[PDB]
Symmetry: C2
Subunit: 246 residues, 2 copies
């Protein structure tokens, strides 16, 4: 089975009109993993995959734009059980440096929070996930997701660090946050710009680069042109429905 | 100015594919009030009204399907201020029987939680709102919203009670939850069926009835036919984009 990644939502902070914030659907064969679960992500997700066919969720961090739809997901599982659609508890993986946030992940027998350990590989069906702590105003982890043949790296949210380069080494697809333009400094907000995303893809030898966690001003296509001044491979701008498959 | 109500989202519990859960936009002249703020509501809302033009939010209760988008709304206000779009704090009205939930409404100088008092009229620009406690598994308040010429009643979530009849007396539009079909009993879930919604519209003399908080099974048009076996006025099924204006 090939690894198939579908962007479900891609705005930073809050949704643009009729769009969504962070959510990425990773699929392999019958396995479905949702990476982050932000604003309007469930609404958009169910157009690709029904709640009962979702096998697991994993959360990079607990900012609203990455977890806003967890509650509604818990209710979706509850309604599924009430309608007889399967009682399998959906695992929701998250870090437990923030205990109060982690405790919200477990809802009756419908969803079960499981703490990932940042120094250990996590198995999720046919995927193996490893983690890198980001530089961000709350605890946040980037993820490297492989199925043994292809490898996708998701930066989650971060300002720039050299450690992203070894972490992302030889990734087929680097999904990098890019909340700021080339002229701007995202350090104080815990975000990166186009040049920084480009630098990671370049020095890591990423197969290609996908820019996401997008801003609500400017010409988004400029983020791609700016990234291409540094990285010579393929660079795309994320949108709901964007599909990568290898 | 006429009172204009736009349904932003109308599913109970969690969103159907490409839809939304509870959110209703009430407008009068330049004033904009959002009643409830559930899953995918911000995404859909911004297609009608940008965040910075939103004057107030009011929350019937703190179930996920009515508040999931509050966090992202707080970030939208923060990004608005960072971009220079106005620093006016958006008031978010809610009950304070649940203190922990009420405390989440205030975020820096961007949003400010204000406790409504259920026994007192609330002024919201040109609207006056009065409240009725519902029968629901968490504290919840129905709302009667008038501008002095027209009056809309929103049941929020509730199982049936006689007190809805005097509360909704002579409303031009009764927006009633209707999470269950005529053959089913919604009492143990704190919800109503089609016959119960119909009964309220009938005995209150409502100008018309709008059924919302919809289920994820069955033929939704049957809810309208069932309600019409009791109420002889106009009955519609809610959908995102539904507009009532008087
Ligand atoms: Ca599955
Ligand atoms: Ca390509
Ligand atoms: Ca306004
Ligand atoms: Ca009509
Ligand atoms: Zn973020
Ligand atoms: Zn963040
Ligand atoms: Zn509800
Ligand atoms: Zn409720």
């Amino acid at each position: 089975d090939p690894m198939k990644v579908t962007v479900i939502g891609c705005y930073g902070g809050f949704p643009a009109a009729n769009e969504a914030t962070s959510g990425y659907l990773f699929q392999s064969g019958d396995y479905s993993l949702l990476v982050d679960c932000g604003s309007a992500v469930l609404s958009k997700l169910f157009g690709y995959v029904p709640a009962e066919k979702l096998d697991a969720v994993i959360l990079s961090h607990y900012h609203h734009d990455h977890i806003a739809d967890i509650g509604p997901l818990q209710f979706a599982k509850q309604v599924g059980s009430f309608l007889g659609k399967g009682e399998h508890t959906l695992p929701i993986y998250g870090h437990d440096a923030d205990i109060e946030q982690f405790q919200k992940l477990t809802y009756k027998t419908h969803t079960k929070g499981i703490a990932f350990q940042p120094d250990q590989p996590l198995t999720a069906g046919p995927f193996t996930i490893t983690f890198l702590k980001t530089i961000h105003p709350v605890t946040c982890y980037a993820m490297r997701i492989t199925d043994g043949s292809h490898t996708v790296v998701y930066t989650a949210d971060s300002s720039y660090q050299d450690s992203f380069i070894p972490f992302s080494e030889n990734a087929d697809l680097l999904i990098s946050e890019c909340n700021f333009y080339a002229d701007q400094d995202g350090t104080s907000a815990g975000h990166m710009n186009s040049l920084e995303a480009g630098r990671i893809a370049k020095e890591a030898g990423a197969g290609e680069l996908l820019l996401t966690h997008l801003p609500h001003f400017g010409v988004h296509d400029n983020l791609r042109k700016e990234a291409k001044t540094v990285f010579s491979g393929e660079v795309n701008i994320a949108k709901s429905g964007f599909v990568w498959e290898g």
